Symmetry: D2
Subunit: 282 residues, 4 copies
């Protein structure tokens, strides 16, 4: 199981560290324009590998991505709009280099804006699975906070953050669930406080790169182990004409299917306004 | 984090193996009447420890359980098994309470439900829990998830009541990816019907790897105070017996009980299940 | 990463349990003549996989070994004992080579040494390894470490030769924290004598230990770990398959490291090899 | 198992991240003068927690270290002492039993200081732990084998003045040189000089190393680590190989060095006395 990360900024290297401490893969290659930085991160992360499951780590050029199952594209560079078209330029340079070396690797895009850059990466790489990290972390926070308030472990909480990664994203309260009940219903049965204030609180919370680092590793593990995990990753969503975060089953071949949630009229509305924002910039 | 397991039959040693392999605890004591088997299983399991986290394994008498956070009690006509097994418990549980009065007692011997009742009275003022239907609930989830084409963590569902032929599958509350299981099958256009459900029901009602691993999960829930929702067996006043329902489990043991909303039929089947146990009790 | 285990007696199933619970592989197949047992143990072990890294577990026929990186051959039923398992091997190994021609083949049946020789014959052009003295070497280390009072990673030592009573403990190279064990024991002012050392030698000479060892060998291959393991392989200097320390990786044994032994240890070794030369 | 970290600079939060990712402990408190920083990272890190270990992570103040088994102090020496003089007593206040793991530079003297401020409590510094680990990793890499089969210590003062004990360097139970000879791999003053550099040189390695030291404590493992502690045959706090457990340093293993090796060591000892 071999993984490459392109761009060893903070996100790339935190993800690489997470992958290593976790034993997610057996080979990990760091690839960056600033070779030296790549060199230094690789060598520092190396002396960390878990005995029970070591990982060859090293830096190299794009040709080293040879046989990567997953490549995590973290490369990136004032209006959101010229962050957008700087990174588009960087992407047009890199993605073809990636496809050249690892034509079959699943491409995991994380640079901001992730949704639009996932769209770009998709067109620059038509014959490859391309996925954006999208709202994965935020969905994870949404669940973590609900579970924290319910007094139960996080695996017992279900909930999605949908749409555009950012202020525009939508919390699908309508589908939020704890121990197999709608959240309101769990809170009531447990005589715990639930209301607009508590939800509003969670809302501000849902919205360092450790969280994203770990998340990127879980998305990667889902692929590496052909896992069919449900993750709200960003992908081209034809109903909306743009790449967006919805829940998607993820495994070795990337996105295996997309299950659009049944939203309230108000949630569905925010979602479409979200999609509009992205349509323009696109 | 210290764990003791009493009675080193297959279940106890398989659990211990699971505990050590996952690094669940840093200290593990095997306690058995047959002090040579105990020492063998302890010296053998001792080898299986994972570097990235080691565990000190050894065998001892009941005094060695001192300061254990969890003790797994595996020592063991149904009615014959039961009383024969109750006698053993009346001997052992007090020796356990002697050595570790504030440890969580995890009962796994069959019949687990009634023996959890017995243990609870032999050891008042100490958290007591039976493994109950934990493994069955897990199978139930695993089978739905496998049929849904999704990882098991996205499946929710309980097996309630008596551990055995009488346990109830709470279909009414089976959930996948946030939806009722059928609604999810309808959304993925996967087959869902009585026969699919009856086949899962067979796989849920069935070598001790499944139970060993579950035993470790419950244990880890306590050691790490994780607030895991597990269908473990505890005395349930509404039924006057110890049976399995979903319970939040943490360091102090059962922190609360979540009585699920069942269909008439299920509640009916649960009460009959409780009757059977009152009958032995 | 896919592994298939063949023959689901206690060793194979314990090995499978260890692999699953540590997440050693993503994909695991149990294959046995007794397909009912295989199905039972596969369904049970499946229920036992940690959520982080999951493993798809199932049972099947030999054709299911398709694309295994490692196949653990544990099938088994003295000259007679040997002649019965040889027959079984002559039936199975070619089935394995059929479906998984590039799998590393990890032989554990007894006698492991001679059967590793047989399997090597039956499956040329494919890495073949026997579990040999891997577990024994681990106990040897564990027991010294336990007596020295330091974690086991800081003990070094090999059990060489024939798996069994004839196996050789290479005391002459035993090491604790980078020193010869005697020197370590003296520095820490602990007892070291013929009576302590024979009690260790005793604990060195249920299947949890071997299960976990088999997993470790398998993980070495799956991850290409370049681990030094005293596994069994044909050793031309002795004309038989024997346990020596070997660097084990994705392609199996990458090299053999012949240890320096005392004249006495080298003797016990060649005596050990003589026997096997008989079979 | 409870761990707290004082000071959530890079070394602190990378150490905590590593603890949380490996599920090394169940509770983890970040304690910092800058409570806003401590708050997110507790919140961000909240998350890298694997499901099947798993850890409660939060921010708070010194009182919140209560019942900690290990406290990692990551919060120049001149200034850093004034800070220790304020914090260590606050730590000893709340967590009197905790093993005190000092990591700030200079870690050696700042360990001696902390030992002063906190008697009757195990105190150790991270010392040369990371460097001993690089040293071994680089030999192993060159030998073509896994890191566990390499043995080697970096001794003395953390920094430019530390001693690689080439005299006891070992691969697969042999002297590194003897292994490279048997394996037919190049070994020559040049190769070693390269290793030397890499050995003695971003906070991933130190983060992971801090976590491994913490786990040795938390799990009472009896691990041999080259941590810094007051060493009475040098009058200063030094890195030697020491057996480490739940009660901190259980013993000290003074390695047999060449005259030239013991040379640099004793030399550095004095450069320490001030």
């Amino acid at each position: 199981m071999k993984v490459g990360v392109v761009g060893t900024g903070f996100v790339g290297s935190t993800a690489a560290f997470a992958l290593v401490l976790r034993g997610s893969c057996s080979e990990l290659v760091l690839v960056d324009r600033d070779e030296d930085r790549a060199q230094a991160e690789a060598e520092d992360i190396a002396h960390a590998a878990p005995v029970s499951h070591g990982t060859r780590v090293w830096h190299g050029g794009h040709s080293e991505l040879a046989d990567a199952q997953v490549v995590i594209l973290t490369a990136g560079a004032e209006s959101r709009l010229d962050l957008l078209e700087k990174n588009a330029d960087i992407f047009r340079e890199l993605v073809p280099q990636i496809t050249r070396a690892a034509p079959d690797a699943v491409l995991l895009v994380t640079s901001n804006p992730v949704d639009l850059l996932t769209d770009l990466a998709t067109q620059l790489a038509p014959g490859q699975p391309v996925i954006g990290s999208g709202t994965v972390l935020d969905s994870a926070r949404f669940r973590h906070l609900m579970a924290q308030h319910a007094g139960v472990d996080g695996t017992h909480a279900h909930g999605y953050v949908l749409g555009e990664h950012g202020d525009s994203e939508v919390l699908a309260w309508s589908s939020a669930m704890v121990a197999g009940m709608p959240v309101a219903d769990f809170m009531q049965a447990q005589n715990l406080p639930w209301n607009e204030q508590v939800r509003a609180k969670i809302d501000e919370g849902t919205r360092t790169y450790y969280g994203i680092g770990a998340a990127l590793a879980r998305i990667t593990e889902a692929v590496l182990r052909d896992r069919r995990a449900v993750l709200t990753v960003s992908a081209p969503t034809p109903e909306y004409g743009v790449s967006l975060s919805l829940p998607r089953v993820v495994g070795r071949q990337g996105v295996l299917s997309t299950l659009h949630p049944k939203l309230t009229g108000d949630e569905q509305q925010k979602l479409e306004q979200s999609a509009g924002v992205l349509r323009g910039f696109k």
